[PDB]
Amino acid sequence: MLSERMLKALNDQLNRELYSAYLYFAMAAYFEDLGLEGFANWMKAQAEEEIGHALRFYNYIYDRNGRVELDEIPKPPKEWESPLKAFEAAYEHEKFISKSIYELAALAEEEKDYSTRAFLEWFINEQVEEEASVKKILDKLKFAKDSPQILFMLDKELSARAPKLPG
């Protein structure tokens, strides 16, 4: 009841979700280097979120009697020219995630796989939130061009989102 193609598509997205976690952990390291602790914790918190998304693929796969197969998680970028560029890369990446979700949806429909299509709805909706939440901070960063002081207030704002795990 998972086709061979579907299963592979699902394990691929699971791998994509794990890669996103690593990308954000990477940006976390990057902002930590800048001394933007607030940004760093925001990004660690976003990594954990992505781990969560992978678990959803992981559970659905097992629920349909599939087998999960873990793949390498690529080396994420080390650096960005700026917090702005880093968020632009996050936004570009979220768009990439979405695109792959639509393709999975398109695949489920093409296979008349109602179950998988339906499981994907959650992701279609989540990605809307994901894209908006990155874009919002991205635009705020545009708005703070030659302004250290704003970057600092944004940092302080963003420190409100802390990773759950270190506890």
Q: Are 105 and 13 in contact (CB under 8 A)?
A: no
What single-letter amino acid sits at 9? Answer: A
In the list Fe ion, a copy of itself, Zn ion, none, the entry touching 161 (Cβ below 5 to 8 angstroms by class) is: none
Q: Residue 162: name the closest of 21, 84, 46 by CA.
A: 46
- Shortest distance (Å) from residue 114 CB to a copy of itself: 5
Give the CB-side neighbour count of residue 111, counting CA atoms within 13 A: 19
In the list Zn ion, Fe ion, a copy of itself, none, the entry touching 88 (Cβ below 5 to 8 angstroms by class) is: none
What single-letter amino acid sits at 161? Answer: R
In the list Fe ion, Zn ion, a copy of itself, none, the entry touching 53 (Cβ below 5 to 8 angstroms by class) is: Zn ion
Q: Are 5 and 107 in contact (CB under 8 A)?
A: yes
Q: Is 81 in the site for a copy of itself (CB under 8 A)?
A: no
Neighbours of 82 (CB within 10 A): 12
| Residue list 27-56, contact with Zn ion (CB under 5 A) | 50, 53
- Give how far Cα 12 sits from Cα of 9, 35, 111, 143, Å: 5, 35, 17, 37
The dihedral sign for the CA sequence 6, 75, 121, 57: positive
In this complex, which beta carbon is closest to a copy of itself, that of residue 4 or of residue 67?
A: 67
Q: Which residue is nearest to Fe ion (CB)?
A: 130
Residues placed in the known binding site for Fe(3+): 17, 49-50, 53, 94, 126, 129-130
Q: Which residues bind Fe ion (CB under 5 A)?
A: 129-130
Q: Which residues bind a copy of itself (CB under 8 A)?
A: 1, 22, 25-26, 29, 32-33, 35, 48, 51-52, 55, 58, 60, 62-65, 67-76, 78, 98, 101-102, 105-106, 112, 114-115, 118-119, 121, 124-125, 127-129, 131-132, 135-136, 139-140, 143-144, 147-150, 152-153, 164-167
